[PDB]
Amino acid sequence: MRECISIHVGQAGVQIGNACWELYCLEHGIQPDGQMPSDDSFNTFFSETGAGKHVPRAVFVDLEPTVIDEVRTGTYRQLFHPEQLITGKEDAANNYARGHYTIGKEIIDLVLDRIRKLADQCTGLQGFLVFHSFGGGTGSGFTSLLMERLSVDYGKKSKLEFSIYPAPQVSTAVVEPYNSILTTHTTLEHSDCAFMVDNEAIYDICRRNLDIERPTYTNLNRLISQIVSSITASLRFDGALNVDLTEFQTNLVPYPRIHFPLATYAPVISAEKAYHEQLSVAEITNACFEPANQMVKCDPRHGKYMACCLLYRGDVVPKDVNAAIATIKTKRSIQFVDWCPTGFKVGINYQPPTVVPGGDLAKVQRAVCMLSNTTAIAEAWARLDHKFDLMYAKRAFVHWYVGEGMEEGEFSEAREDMAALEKDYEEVGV
Amino acid sequence: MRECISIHVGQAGVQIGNACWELYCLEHGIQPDGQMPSDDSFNTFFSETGAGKHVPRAVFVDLEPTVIDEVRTGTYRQLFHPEQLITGKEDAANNYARGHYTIGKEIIDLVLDRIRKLADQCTGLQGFLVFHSFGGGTGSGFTSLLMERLSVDYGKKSKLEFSIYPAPQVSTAVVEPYNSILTTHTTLEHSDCAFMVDNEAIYDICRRNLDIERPTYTNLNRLISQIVSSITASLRFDGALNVDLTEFQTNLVPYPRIHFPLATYAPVISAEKAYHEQLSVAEITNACFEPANQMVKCDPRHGKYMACCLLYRGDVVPKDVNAAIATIKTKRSIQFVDWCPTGFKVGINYQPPTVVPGGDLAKVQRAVCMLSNTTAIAEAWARLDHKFDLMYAKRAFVHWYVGEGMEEGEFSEAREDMAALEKDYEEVGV
Amino acid sequence: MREIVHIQAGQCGNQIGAKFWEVISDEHGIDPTGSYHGDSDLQLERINVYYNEATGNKYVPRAILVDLEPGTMDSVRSGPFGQIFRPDNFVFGQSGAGNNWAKGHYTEGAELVDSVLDVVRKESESCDCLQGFQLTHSLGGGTGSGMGTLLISKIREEYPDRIMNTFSVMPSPKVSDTVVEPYNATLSVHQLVENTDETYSIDNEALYDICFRTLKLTTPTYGDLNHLVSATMSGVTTCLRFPGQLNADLRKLAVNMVPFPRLHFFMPGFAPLTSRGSQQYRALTVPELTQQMFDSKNMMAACDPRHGRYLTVAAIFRGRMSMKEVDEQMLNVQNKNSSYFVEWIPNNVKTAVCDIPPRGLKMSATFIGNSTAIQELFKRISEQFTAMFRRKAFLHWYTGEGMDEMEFTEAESNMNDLVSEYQQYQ
Amino acid sequence: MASSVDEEALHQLYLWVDNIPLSRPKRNLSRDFSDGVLVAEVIKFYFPKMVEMHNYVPANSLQQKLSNWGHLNRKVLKRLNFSVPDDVMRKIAQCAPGVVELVLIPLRQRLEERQRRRKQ
C-alpha cells in the first residue's frame, strides 16, 4: 500500500539519496543495518523481509562507480540491495549525448529490469521520486532515456521530478546549459510535476538563516531531504488533512504543461536561533512567501501565484492555518492570478520534523512545506535561454554532441521547446 | 438399518474421505481409535463389533500408495480396516486409459470383493457415496470401471455421485478435460444423482466469506464433508421432516437423465464473523441463492430452477422456512421453470452442525444444505465441450489413450454424449 | 515401489551422476560409508527408489557406472563418495573412445555392452516394481554419445514399457572443447528421439550464464555446473520419493508434458538461485520463485524461449506452502505472456508441490519446459554438421570403424526432420 | 449510397432508440447500453419470447458487465448470426464511445431481418 519507487541518477542523485535515506531511517527508526529495534508507516518507502529487515525501494544509477562504490563502503553499504545500485564503466563527461545514446544505452535495460523487480512487490504503488541534476551528464542523458521508457511502461503512475537547477551566477561547468536544455523535453512530456533546485539561493538560505559560514553540499542535502519527506509526509503518517500524492499534484496543476512549482521550507533556523522564538504557525506561514526564503533565485514578487499548497506538519492547528492565510490574502504585495481567489490548499500532518544529529537545522515543534507554482519562475529560465543562445551562436561545444550520435537540429528543437514553455507560462498570468 | 457404503477413488477421493471421516467421528463422538467413551445413530456409517469398536464401511482405492499409506501413518491408521483400503502398484498417470483398462483391471476384482464384504453386514443398505475427481486418472478410469460393475451387482441401490469438477480458469493438468469427458458416460448411465464440485468457486467462497487469505485443500475438504454430512443428516439423526435418501433423489430428479444438481452450504462464515450476526433462517435461505455462494462457477441467474430442496439442520422452525420461501418465490430475479410452481422441498433436522476444532468455519446454531438442479449448470459444461474440441482437433494427447488400449472413436462417442446431455438440459428449460 | 535404475555414461555423465548421488545422499541423510544418518523418517520410506537395502542397515545406490577408460573410474572411486558404490557396477574398458562415436557404438563399447547388460538386468531384478531408467551422459565426444545410445537402445528393446528419461549435456559453438562434437551430437540425437521417452537438454553455456549472471561466482568450476545439473536431477523425481499435496512422478510429468511422441526434448531449470551476498536480502516467497523461474537467465540452454512458444511447462514446487498463489502465478505467467505460450493449448503448466523442502531451503521450484525455441540448438548443430559434412572431413576415423556415409546422411536428415516438427507448431 | 458512415447516422441512431418505448429513466444512452441489459430490453420489443431477462443481472462493476456481455454474445447474438471479438467487447464494457454504437447500427438491421423471415 502507498509505495513509491525512488530513482537516483547521477552523482547528485545518488548523494541526495544518501542524505534522504539517512533522514528516512532516522524518522522511521531503522538502523543503518536495516533492523527495527523495539504500524506499517515504513511500507511507503521500505520493503520488509521475513528476518525483520527494512529494504529500501530505491535505485542508485551512476555511469561512473566512484560515488556509488563509495556508498558500498559507507555506513549504508548493508542497508541497500547491492545490485539494485547500478554502476557503469564510463563516466558521462557532463555530456547529454553519450548519456542519452551511447553509454546509458547498455545499462538502461538493467535499470528498467530492477525497476520492474521493485514494482512487482508494490501492491499500492503511488508514484516515482527521481532525483538528478540538470547540468550533469548522467542526470541529463540517462534521465532523458529513462523517463521515456517509464512513461510507456508506467504511464498511469505519477512521476514527481526533483531536479537540481543551475544558478544565475554560481556554476560548476561551462556545458551545463547544454545539458539543461535537452532535459526540457523530458519534464514537459514525461513528467507530471517537476521541482527545481537552485544551489545559490539555498546558499543564501544557509548563509542568512542557519548562521553557518561554511556548510557543504551535505547541508544542502539535509534540507532537500526534509522538503521531499515533507511532501511525502501525508502518505506515511497520520494527519487531520492528509493530502494524497495524486490529490497533491491535482491541486498543483492548472494545465498539463504548467506543472513546475517552486518549493520552500520553514522554519530553516539554527539551533542557537530556535530558542529565542516561539515559532508560531503564522510566522512560518509568513516566512515562506518571503523572497529571501525561495529555493530558486527568482523573485515571487515579480510574478503571480496560481496554486498554493500548505503542507504543515507537527503541532499545528488548522484554525491557525486559516488565520494565517487570511493575513496572507490580506496583503497586496502577494498578488495571485485571477484564477484562484480560493488560493490555498491546506495539508496538516501530526509528525514533528525529524532532526539529523549531525545537521545544522534546529529542532522545532512545527514545520511547514511550501510548494507553489508561479509565473515568476520563468525568469530562472529567462536567463538560461539567453545563456544557451550565447553558446549556440557559434555552435560552441556541439562537435561532441554531434560526435556522440546527436542530431545537430536537436538543439533547435530544444530551444524551440523552451521558448514554447516560456510563452506558456506567460499567457496564463493575464 | 439405513447403511451406506462410501467409495473413495483417487487421491482426491481418499483425502476427502480422510476429512469426511474426521468430521463423522467428531459429530458421532468416536475417538480416532474407534472407541465410544460414555442410540444407533452411527449404524448409518459405522459398523460395530463385540469389543465396542466403530469400524467405518468405506473403501480407499488408489492406484498409487502414497496418499493411502500416508493414511496408514496418520491418526486414523487404526480407525480403518487396513485391507479395506486398497493400494495399487502403478499410478494412473492422469490417464483414463490405463485406469479403465490396464492398471485398474487387476485391482478392481479385489475392490468389488471388499464391497461385497461391506454389503453383507448392511441389513438396510440405503445407497453409495463414491468420491473422486473428474480430472484425475484414477478418479476417471477406476470409477468408470467400478460403477459399471456396481450397476449390475447393486442395480437397485441408489448411487450418489460426489465428484470434483475442473474450474473455468484454475487447472492442475492439461489432460483434465480428456479425463472428464470419458467420465460423462458413467454419470449418465451408471449414476443416480451426481454432485459436481468446482475448486475455483469455493476458492472464492473461502476468500470472501471465511476471510482466510491462505487456506489449503484441507479447508475445501472441511466443507465438502459438511455438505455430504448435511445430505446424510436425515438418515442419522432425528428431525421433524426427515428426508429419506430415496425421497431426496425422487425430489431432485425430474427425468432419469436430468440428475445433476448444484450444491451450496450456509452459513459459510468465519468465527470472528459469527458473533455480529443473529444468523436467522431467512438470511441463510437468502444466501444460498446468491451466485457468490455457488459451489460451481456458473450463474444461477443465467438459468432456471427445476427442483429445490431445503435441507435445514439445527434450531430451525419450519414456519420460518415457509416464511423464507414465500420471500424466495416473491422476487422475480429467481425464476423457476414452469415445471415447479410448488418449487421447494423442505427438510429439517434437529442436530446442529458439528465444528472441526482445527477448521476455519464458525459455530452456528443453524445450518442449511442447499441442493438444486438448474439449467445454468450447462455453462460449466459449455466451456468444457469447447475446451475438449480445442485439444481433440489435432488428436492432442490421444496416442497415450490409444497406446493403453482405448479405441480412438471413444472420444467421438464421448463428445457425442456430452452434446446429448447439453441438449437435454436445454429443452427442459422451455 | 517405483524403483528407478541409474546408468552413468562418459566422464561427464559419471561425474555429474556421482555429484547427484552426493546431493541426494545428503537429502536422504546417508553417510559416506553408506549408513543412514538422517533426522526424520521421511528420508527413510522411499530409500528403495534410489538405494538397495543391505546388511548393517547400509544402502547402496542402484547405479551402473559405464566408461571406456579406467581413469574416470579411478577418480570417482577416490572421490568424496566413491566407497558407497558397488564394485561390480564399475564396468569399464581400457582403451578410450577418443571422442569417436563409431568406436563407442561399434567396436569399443560393443564388447562392453554385454558386461553392462548383465549388471543392469541384475539391478532391475533386484527391484520390487521398476519404474524406469535415469541415464546420465554427454552428447559430446564418442563415449557418452557413442555407447550411451547403444545401451539405451538395448534397454529400450528389452524394457519397452518402462520410463526412459535421459539428462544430456550437449555441445555448443562458443564453449566447444572438442573439434568433432557435432558428428557425435547428430549421431546421438538420432537414437535419442526414436528410443527415449524423455530427454532433458543441458547446454554448458547457459550453465556458465547462470553461474556468472545470477550466482555471481568469480570462479565457478566444473563441479558447480554439475551441481546446477544435479539440482534439477533431484527435483524432477521429488514427488515419488517424498509426500506432497500434488504427487507427480515421472509418468505424471510424461502424460502432461509431451503432446506428440517425438516432442520430448525439454528445458530444465531450478529456483531459487542467488549469490552468497544476495541471499541475505531476497524474499523467497513463491511468487518471486515464479518470476525467477520463467526468466530466460534461469534456464540451462542457450535457446531463448522468447524465440518460440511453450508447448508444455512443468513446475514441480517443493516446501510447506499453500497453492492458490501457485495457481495464480501459473495462470498469470501464461496470461500476461500468452504470446510466449501456445494459445491453441490453454493451460500449458503442470503443477506439483512437495511437502518437505530441500535441506537448508524453506522452499524450491524445479522448471521443466517444452518450448518450440529449443530448436535453436538442434538447427545450429545441423548447420555446424553441414559445415563439416558437405565435402568430407574426419570421416576416415568413422569409416575406419565400419561406419558409413549414408548413415551420416540419414542422421542429418533426421535432425532436419526434428527441427521441422518443432518449427511446425511455433 | 453512402459508402462510409457520416456524423448524421449517429444522430439518426440516437433518436431511434428514444423512439422505441423502453422502460428506462432519463440518462444518456452511451453509458446505459454499456451495461448490456439495456440491449436485450431493446430487443424484447421485437421478440419478447427469445429474451428471457432471467439470465443477465444489472450491476456496475466491469467484471459483471463483461460476464453479462459474454453471455449475451452466445445467447442473443448467435441467434442473430452475429459474432464479435473479445477485443471489441472489452471496449463496449468500458462505455467506449463509438464502439458499442458500431454494434447498435447492424443490430436493428438483423432484427428486421428476423422479422421478415417466415418462421413457423
Ligand SMILES: CC(=O)O[C@H]1C(=O)[C@@]2(C)[C@H]([C@H](OC(=O)c3ccccc3)[C@]3(O)C[C@H](OC(=O)[C@H](O)[C@@H](NC(=O)c4ccccc4)c4ccccc4)C(C)=C1C3(C)C)[C@]1(OC(C)=O)CO[C@@H]1C[C@@H]2O
Ligand atoms: C546459508 C544459506 O541459506 O545458503 C543456502 C542457499 O540457499 C544458496 C546460497 C544455495 C547454495 O548453493 C550454492 O552455493 C551453489 C553453488 C553452485 C551451484 C549450485 C548452488 C548452498 O551451497 C546450497 C544449499 O542448498 C541445499 O542444501 C539444497 O538442499 C540443495 N543441495 C545442495 O545444494 C548441496 C550442497 C552440497 C552438497 C550436497 C547438496 C538441493 C537443491 C535441489 C535439489 C536437491 C538439493 C543451501 C540451502 C545454501 C548453500 C549451503 C550456501 C543455492 O543452492 C541451491 C541448490 O539452492 C545457490 O543458489 C541457491 C539458493 C541460495 O543462493
Ligand SMILES: Nc1nc2c(ncn2[C@@H]2O[C@H](COP(=O)(O)OP(=O)(O)OP(=O)(O)O)[C@@H](O)[C@H]2O)c(=O)[nH]1
Ligand atoms: N544542490 C546540489 N547540487 C549538486 C550536488 N551535487 C551535484 N550537484 C549539481 O550537479 C551539477 C553537475 O553535475 P555532476 O556533478 O557532473 O553530476 P552528474 O549528474 O552525475 O553528471 P555526470 O558527472 O556528468 O555524470 C552541478 O552544477 C550541481 O549543481 C549536491 O550535492 N547538491
Ligand SMILES: Nc1nc2c(ncn2[C@@H]2O[C@H](COP(=O)(O)OP(=O)(O)OP(=O)(O)O)[C@@H](O)[C@H]2O)c(=O)[nH]1
Ligand atoms: N476440491 C478438491 N479437489 C481436489 C483435491 N485433490 C485433488 N483434487 C482434484 O483432482 C484433480 C486431479 O486429479 P489427481 O490430483 O491426479 O488425483 P487422482 O484422481 O487420484 O488422479 P491420479 O493421480 O491420476 O490417479 C485436480 O484437478 C483437482 O481438482 C482436493 O483436495 N480438493
Ligand SMILES: Nc1nc2c(ncn2[C@@H]2O[C@H](COP(=O)(O)OP(=O)(O)O)[C@@H](O)[C@H]2O)c(=O)[nH]1
Ligand atoms: N556441463 C559440463 N560439461 C562438461 C563437463 N566436463 C566436460 N564437459 C564438456 O562436455 C563435453 C562432453 O564430451 P566428453 O564427455 O569428453 O566426450 P566422451 O569422452 O566421448 O564422453 C566435453 O567436450 C566437455 O567440454 C562437466 O563437468 N560439466
Ligand SMILES: [Mg+2]
Ligand atoms: Mg556524474
Ligand SMILES: [Mg+2]
Ligand atoms: Mg492419483
